[PDB]
Amino acid sequence: LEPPTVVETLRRGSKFIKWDERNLVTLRVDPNGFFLYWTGPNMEVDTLDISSIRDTRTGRYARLPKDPKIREVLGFARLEEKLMTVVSGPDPVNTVFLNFMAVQDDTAKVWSEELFKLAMNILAQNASRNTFLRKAYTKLKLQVNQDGRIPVKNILKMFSADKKRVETALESCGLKFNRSESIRPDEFSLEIFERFLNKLCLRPDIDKILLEIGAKGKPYLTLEQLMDFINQKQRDPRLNEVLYPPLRPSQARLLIEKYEPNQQFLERDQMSMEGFSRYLGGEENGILPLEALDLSTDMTQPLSAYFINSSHNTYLTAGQLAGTSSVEMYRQALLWGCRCVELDVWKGRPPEEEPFITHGFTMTTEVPLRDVLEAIAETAFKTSPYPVILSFENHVDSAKQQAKMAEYCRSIFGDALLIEPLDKYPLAPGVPLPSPQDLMGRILVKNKKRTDEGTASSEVNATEEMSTLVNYIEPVKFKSFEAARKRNKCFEMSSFVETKAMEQLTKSPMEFVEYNKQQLSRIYPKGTRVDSSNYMPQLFWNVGCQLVALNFQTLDVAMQLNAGVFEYNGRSGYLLKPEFMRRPDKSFDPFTEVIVDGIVANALRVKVISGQFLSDRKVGIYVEVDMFGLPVDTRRKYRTRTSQGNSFNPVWDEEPFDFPKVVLPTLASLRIAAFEEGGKFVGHRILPVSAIRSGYHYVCLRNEANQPLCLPALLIYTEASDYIPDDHQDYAEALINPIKHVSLMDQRARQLAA
Amino acid sequence: RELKLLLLGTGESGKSTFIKQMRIIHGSGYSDEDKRGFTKLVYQNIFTAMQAMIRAMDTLKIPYKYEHNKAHAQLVREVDVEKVSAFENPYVDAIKSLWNDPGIQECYDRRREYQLSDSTKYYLNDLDRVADPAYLPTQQDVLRVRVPTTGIIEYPFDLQSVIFRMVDVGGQRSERRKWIHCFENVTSIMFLVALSEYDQVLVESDNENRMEESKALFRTIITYPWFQNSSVILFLNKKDLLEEKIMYSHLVDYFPEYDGPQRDAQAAREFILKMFVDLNPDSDKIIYSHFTCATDTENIRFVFAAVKDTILQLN
Ligand SMILES: Nc1nc2c(ncn2[C@@H]2O[C@H](COP(=O)(O)OP(=O)(O)O)[C@@H](O)[C@H]2O)c(=O)[nH]1
Ligand code: ALF
Ligand SMILES: [Ca+2]
Ligand SMILES: [Mg+2]
C-alpha cells in the first residue's frame, strides 16, 4: 500500500468550467492529499473532502447536460471526453454529484484517474491520529475569506464544545482573540496549532501513562524506559520472537529524532511529555498493523470457502413498497466492495418489448434492464478485480423476450462474462468450485437451467437462451442435507429465506457447516421486513454461509458490521473462512461452550481511557463495547458511564471490560461505538480480535458507512493474549521458562529430604 | 480410527522438516508446481543469511580482506528481505564476491556467537545453481528452506491401515503458551532435539544454552501428570551437523561431565543420549530413542517405519 502521493498536475491546478443542472474555477489538491478546493463563485473556497468521494466518472460514463440553456453555453462529439463527474456522499442512498467540464484537452482523464486513487487509498483511510489532526488543520488553512485570511468564527465552529476557553486559547498564543476578526495564514503555522491544541485540551490521562511506565523523575522519559515501553506494553504478546523481533537501542532512536522536538532534550536521548504525546498518534503506534489491511489473504482456496459480500434487492432506495428503484444503487454498492447483486427482471410492455427491473406488485417504479446491465458492466472491477455473481430472478414468461436479456448479457459484458467453464475444473460431480484468483474479472450469472418469500418463491423455468450462461453457480430446489451429500455435485447452490434457514440452523448445525464446505448457500431476508430492516448476519456466518444478503439501503447495526468486516483484505469483498470451517477432515460445532481442540482461543480485555473532540455541543457521551463472534463469545455487552457533560476531553474512570473466553478469535470482531446522551450516534470502529494490538493506542471513529472522521477519537488500552485454562495455568508457566522451572523443581525435592 | 501424534521440540530444531518428509514419503509429494512455489523463499534465505553475516562483522570487529569486496557490503546491507522476488545481476555479483572473502569465512567459522541458519552453506556453495534464470528448486532445495512456524497446524497422513494426525507446533518461548490447546487426546510425543545445539545460545535469550533448555523442556514434558500413558519417542535430529561441529569445537567446554575422548562423533552421540534418558524419574516407562537426519529421506523412511510399528504394537 502506497502513501497518498499527489501528482504535480493536481497541485498546480487546472481550470474547469464547473456547471450544475458557467462559472470558471481552478481545482487544486493540497500537497498532503487531503482536500479538493476551488475558488468559488463568491470568491470563497468550498472544500470537498477527498476521503468522502465515492467515485470520479468521466468520458461517456459521466452525467450529460439536459438543460438546453446549459448545453449551448458549454459548446455542444469531442465534448464527451472532457466531462468529469465527482460523486460523493456519506451513504450510498444519498449521493451529492459534482459536475465539471474542462477547457483544456486531455486533462479530464489524468484528473479523474488520480482523483480516484486518493479517494480509494488504504493508508489514507487507516492513517494515524497525527495525520487526522493535520487534516483538520488543512481545513482551516484552505477555507479563508475574500481577503485571504482565516476568520475566527471558522476556528470557533470547529471546537464548538466550548467558547470561552477557545477565545482565551488564541489570546495566549498572541493571535486574534475577538470573534469577528481574521487571522492571516502566515501567522497560523502548524507549530502554533500544536500549541493551540495543547493550551486548550488539557489531558490528565497521558500523565497517568507517564507515571506508570517509570517516569518518577518528572521531566523526561529515558531511552532505556522507552524500549521497555514498546517491547512490553505496545507489543502484541501472541506474535513470534523470530518473525516480529523486539526493538533495539539503535532502532528506537529514530523515533526520538522523529517525534521529540526539544533539541536540548534530543541530544541526551530523552523524550519529553510533548514528545510522548506525539508518539502515541504516530504512524508506528496504530491499532491495526500494515499486514491486516492489504490484500494478503490466500486466494487459492475454492469459492465455497469465502465470505462473499452480498446485497438483497439492490435496486431499491427505500422500503419494499413505497420507495423508488434506481440504477445508481448498483454502482454505489459494487464500489463499496459488494460482489453479489440481485436483479428482479419482469416481462416488458406489449408495444415496446424491453425487460425491466421492479418489485412484484408493490407499486415500485421500473428501471430498464439494459441500463442496469450497463451499470454492472462499468463498475464491477473498479475497486477489486474479483468475480461478481449476478443473482437473477427471472419472471419473464416469454420465450421470445428471453433472447433479449440473453443477448444483453453477451453484448454489454462481452469478454468478462463467463459462458463456458474453466479448463481446469469441469462440470462433473466431485470436483470443487474454482478459486477467486481463477476468475479475476469474470461475471457469473445465476439462473435456472434445463409466504415469507414473496416474489422469490414463484419464478418461471428458464429456456435454452438463458441456460447457456449458467455454468458454475446454479440454483437448485432444496430437498435435504443427506441428498445434498449423496449427490456430491459441488457446483450447485440453494438460496434459503431467513426464517427457513433459522429452523435449519438449530435443527442441525453440525450438518449445515459440512454443506458449506462443498457448495454455496445464499441467505436473504424475508418478506415480512417491509421496512428494509436487516437481520444480524453473524447468525448465519457462524455456520459458514457465504452469500448472506443484506439490504444496502438502511445502515442499522447489521450493515455497520457488513461494511466493517469487509474493509479488511484490501476492500476486496472476500474474507477467508477460518481453517476449521473449510477443511473436510475436521469438523466443529458452532454452538460450542468449551475451547475447541486445535483452535487457539484468546482472552481480550478492553478498557476505555478517555476521548477527544467527540461532538459539537455540551453533551454526555458513553462508549459501547460488543463482540460479534460465535454465540459463546457474544454473551457480554459492556457500556461505560456517561461523562459529566464534556464532549471535549471526557475521561472515564472505568474497570476493564473482560472478554475472557474468545473461543474462535479468527472469526469474532470487536465493536467500539461512542454514543451521546439520549442515544444519538457519533462514531464506531470494528476491529478484529486477531490483529488488535496491546497497550495505549488510538481509535479513530468512523461514521455509519465506514468513512473516517477527522476530529473524533478515543483512547483505549487492550491486552490481547492467549487463553490459558484455569485448571492448568501453572503448567503453562513451566513451558515458557523451563530453565528457571527445572532449577526450582529439584529444589522442592531436595529440601523435602531434610 | 486415527491417532494424534505431537511433534514437540524447541526452536530451530527441525519439526516442519520432519513433516515435509512425511509429505514426501507417506503423502502427496512436491510436484513440479509445488517446487516452483518455493523459489521465493530460497532467495529470502540467501539474503537473510548474508545480512546477518554482514552485521556480524562490526560487532566482532573483523576487517575485510579485499577492499573491492567491502564496497559490495553496503549494497546487500540495504536489501529489504521480505520484498525480494527476483535474484538479479548486482545482487548475485555482490554476494558471490562476498562469499569467497577470507574475512567472511573467518566470520562463518565463528557463527556460534550470533544466530545463523543451518542451511547457510548449502545455498552459498551452489550459488551457480540457484542464480540461473531457469531455476527450479530441487527436492533437496525445498527441504533446506527456513520458514518459522507459528501456531498449531494438524497434518493427517494415510498409511493404508491407520491415519496419523501429526500436529506441528512452534518452538519459541512465546509459542509454548499455545501448546495447551493440542494436549488433549495425545497418543505419542515425538520430541525433536538437535544434536548440534551444544554451543549456540538461544535466539530469544542470548545468554542461556540451547542444549540445556531442550534438556529442561524434556524434563518438564514427561513429568506432567497429563502424559501418564503416552509413549514419548525421543528423536535426535541433525546427525550430520554433529560430525562437522565435533571436529573443531568440543563438548567438554560446554558440559564438564564429559569423560569421553575428543573428536569422537560416535561416543558423543551416546553421551547426549545418556544426558536425555537419565531425566526419567520412573524406570518402568521407557523412552524409544532414535538418532535421525531430517533431510535424508532414507534416514526418515528407515526411522519412521520403526516408529510406525512401535506405535501400532503398543496400541
Ligand atoms: N543439515 C541438516 N539440517 C537440518 C536437519 N534437520 C533440520 N535441518 C534444518 O533446520 C532448519 C530449521 O528447521 P525447521 O523446520 O524450521 O524447525 P521449526 O522452526 O521448529 O519449524 C531447517 O532449515 C533445516 O534445513 C538435518 O538433519 N541436517
Ligand atoms: F519451532 Al520453529 F520455526 F522455531 F517451528
Ligand atoms: Ca427479490
Ligand atoms: Mg515447524
Numbering used by the authors:
A (entry chain B): 13 to 33, 38 to 92, 97 to 470, 575 to 878
B (entry chain A): 38 to 352
Quote the study that presented this structure, word for word.
pmcPhospholipase Cβ (PLCβ) enzymes cleave phosphatidylinositol 4,5-bisphosphate (PIP2) in the plasma membrane to produce inositol triphosphate (IP3) and diacylglycerol (DAG), (1, 2). PLCβ enzymes are under the control of G protein coupled receptor (GPCR) signaling through direct interaction with G proteins, Gαq and Gβγ (6–8).
The structure of the complex contains density for the PLCβ3 catalytic core and the proximal CTD, but the CTD linker and the distal CTD are disordered, suggesting conformational heterogeneity of the domains with respect to each other. The overall complex is very similar to the previously determined crystal structure, including the X-Y linker engaged in the active site, with a Cα rmsd of 0.84 Å (10). Despite the disordered distal CTD, which was previously shown to be part of the PLCβ3·Gαq interface, the interface between the PLCβ3 catalytic core and Gαq is extensive, burying ~1,500 Å2 and involving 56 residues, 27 from Gαq and 29 from PLCβ3. Despite our finding that the X-Y linker is involved functionally in Gαq-dependent activation, we do not observe structural differences at the active site or its interface with the X-Y linker, even with extensive classification targeting that region. Two different membrane-associated reconstructions of the PLCβ3·Gαq complex were observed, in which the catalytic core associates with the membrane and orients the active site toward the membrane. The PLCβ3·Gαq orientation seems more poised for catalysis as the active site is oriented directly toward the membrane.
